Amino acid sequence: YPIINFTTAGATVQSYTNFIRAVRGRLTVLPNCVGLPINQRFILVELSNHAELSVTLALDVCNAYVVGYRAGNSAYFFHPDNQEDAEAITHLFTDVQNRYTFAFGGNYDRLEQLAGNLRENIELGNGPLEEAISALYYYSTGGTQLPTLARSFIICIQMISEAARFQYIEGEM
């Protein structure tokens, strides 16, 4: 799958905008993914911060949304909404040692609920993304609690998936 790199380290409006344009350019926004081969069904987005920590998000080309991610030797996947997606995601991060599928989905309503106690007033920006990348990475070694993970997913989804999605839709008027 195509790999799209972005770092928060020395990030500008231009570097971030080019990043989102790149993602948007790989989308084929369709109400549902079906007539699409699994060899081009996903976009991989490698995120890294100032701490040099790096995670790779798996984005569905049909809707731009995060279906799962990789952090070093571990891969995490949101509960697939159906059998097609259940086996589609098995083609992601195939060389990773540890694989886990959450029982919950990656939709906003679920994530908001899971962040519950914590995340009000979720601030977006380079700073938050930077911290979100670390949260994603440390989840794999027990350093990140579920509510923090949920908040971190929201940050990534709003700054990446939702940004690309919005630009695609304004792109087609």
Swiss-Prot record:
Binding of AMP, residues: 65-66, 106-108
Phenotypic consequence of residue 82 to A: No effect on the toxic activity but Suppresses the vascular leak syndrome
Catalytic activity: Endohydrolysis of the N-glycosidic bond at one specific adenosine on the 28S rRNA
Annotated positions binding a carbohydrate: 3-5, 10, 35, 126-131
Effect caused by changing residue 61 to A/M: No effect on the toxic activity or the vascular leak syndrome
Active-site residues, Swiss-Prot/TrEMBL: 65, 108, 162, 165
Effect of residue 60 to A/E/N: Suppresses the toxic activity
Glycan-bearing residues: 5
Superkingdom of the source species: Eukaryota
Function description: Acts as a glycosidase that removes a specific adenine residue from an exposed loop of the 28S rRNA (A4324 in mammals), leading to rRNA breakage. As this loop is involved in elongation factor binding, modified ribosomes are catalytically inactive and unable to support protein synthesis. Can inactivate a few thousand ribosomes per minute, faster than the cell can make new ones. Therefore a single molecule can kill an animal cell.
Name by which UniProt lists this protein: Ricin A chain
Gene source species: Ricinus communis
The organism's taxonomic lineage, starting at the top: Eukaryota, Viridiplantae, Streptophyta, Embryophyta, Tracheophyta
